[model samples]
Target: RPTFYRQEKTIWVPERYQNLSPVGSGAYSVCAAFDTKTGLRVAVKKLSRPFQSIIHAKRTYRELRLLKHMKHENVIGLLDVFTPARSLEEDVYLVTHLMGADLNNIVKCQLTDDHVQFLIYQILRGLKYIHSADIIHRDLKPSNLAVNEDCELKILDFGLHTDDYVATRWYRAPEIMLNWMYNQTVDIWSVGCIMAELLTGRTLFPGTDHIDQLKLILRLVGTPGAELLKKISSESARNYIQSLTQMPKMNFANVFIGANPLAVDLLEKMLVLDSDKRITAAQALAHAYFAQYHDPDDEPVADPYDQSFESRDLLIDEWKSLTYDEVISFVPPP
Candidate 1:
């Protein structure tokens, strides 16, 4: 076997994975390839500086652990992990089964209401599994959801919460913006944003900045009442919101005009300003909107993830040892 597969620009993967071609890049460089060992096409990600800092190391450790821990049809699966370097200081690798395209690309194509329904059903199903394990996908966007030609969808990119550099503010939940302690409901807010984009093929709340983002949200959902405002820990945030001129809540039907009544109904529940009033992933699944696709028995919940590692603070080398140990600890399914 060849020492490495150098088909793509500057990618050095083991010989078992061949025909490497770039799929996407950001923090990790992803390439689509064929795995000889598993006889399956896979997406291999190269994390070039996993231990560059405590933040980087912790994120890497959390992602690797969570990826291995999660096992669901609607969630992306880890196929294999490898590193060609003898030392853990070098880039780390992750492998998973490949799919045709993400929702970002797929949404450009025309979609029917039924397509929207089933696609959203799968999102809620997967999210139900995630939330059941007390996890939150702080970054849920069109690009993070992949789909095959048959409309099979899977959620990817988990572990850490959102950073301004990594994700957009359009789908962010208001509680997060107001500096209120947030929870799984933030993900439900993202789902509502994604659903709106899927239906209209346009971003619902396109804000220029953080302040603009809040204003945009208030414009549609209307101002939050005193109860919700009291939840905010930041006095400035509360005052800024309270200072804004109140506008009556916008009608969902008017915004998503010509949309299915049930679809609009579901959107109304999901896009609520109050996190406490927001519809949950499980509740959204049971909504009449998903009657055609909702299958309670088929939607699985994951076991609570072991979060003991998150509480620790270690040096880069210590993180390296933990992450390296994690890479070797995975046991492939039969």
Candidate 2:
């Protein structure tokens, strides 16, 4: 726990929440679970040390505003927000209903085809909801998805979550990866990665670093040609791609090998290099891959606190060792 700000005092949880235990940690926040006096359980996410400058504060506030306005079952619920009473510098705290383990943990274990379909269906439903709100999750991965006791899926983590952050490394869309301006379609690319991981039980592009990640994406999805490359805004990206003698090309059949044809088709639409051609979340939800499993309008709203913690599936011990190649191997036949 490195403090990001010097004047900021340590965040204090009321004695009632003393029973809370650390559940997960992300780049900028840590989540804890506690039992309330009413015997109900809740989760609290304490923000990491604040950024040193006002620019960081403004960005944080922007993210908070977006989260406050976003309401969807597939996305995590933000119950309340607090500012420390005693600190000279205000520290923001986000309170949410505790959710069960994220999908990243579940993928390390045995996954049923039904489970995969259900998860993807729920993710698409959530993404569609966000898009309708004119917001983009920006980051959609197994780690950002939560599954409750009833196996309901909910998306979380809005710190780096923005309509503009684009993709990060492997799951990033070609347009975004190349620094091309983008919107909601960027999230579709991430869904494509999540689907691939769920099927194969591996990361889609587990590159050693950012450059490695770009190479990995190129290998599977193919590089953008001259016309497409010209659309990118970053001179560095264009130069990097041009420098490569042999650009990588995606092998849908190879990447998704035995994946269901419907699933593969949907993935292709999402992972397209050209943002214009990328499938909209609404269009994706309508794909045949989910036709049998989802009814977005009719589904019951998920309750995060009602989740169970006793099941072994709640733990994701193999996350550190998980790899990209292992995930692609799980694709089912078309």
Q: Which number leads on lDDT?
A: 1
Model 2 regions more than 4 Å off: 1-11, 15-18, 24-31, 35-38, 48-53, 83-90, 158-168, 234-236, 239-243, 246-251, 296-334
Q: Candidate 1 residues 1-334, lDDT tens each? A: 2365455455568888887788666644778899898898899888867776898778788889988988988899988888777765557788998877877767778789999999999899999999998887777877788899889988987221344422467877877765676778899999999899889888888877777888888888988887888878888877877889987899989999989899999999999877778999989999999989888898888987888877788876777887888987888766
User: What's the alpha carbon RMSD for model 2?
Assistant: 13.5
TM-score of 1: 0.92
Off by over 4 Å in 1: 1-9, 87-90, 158-167
Query: How many clashing residue pairs, candidate 2?
Result: 17
Candidates' TM-scores? 0.92, 0.73
Question: Top model by TM-score, which number?
Answer: 1
Which lDDT value does model 2 have at 32? Answer: 63
User: What tens-digit string does per-residue lDDT give for candidate 2 at 96-214?
Assistant: 66677766567777776677778888888877766665555665656677887788988876433322212346566656654567877888888888788878777888766667777
lDDT values for all models: 0.82, 0.63
For candidate 1, the per-residue lDDT at 177 reads 61
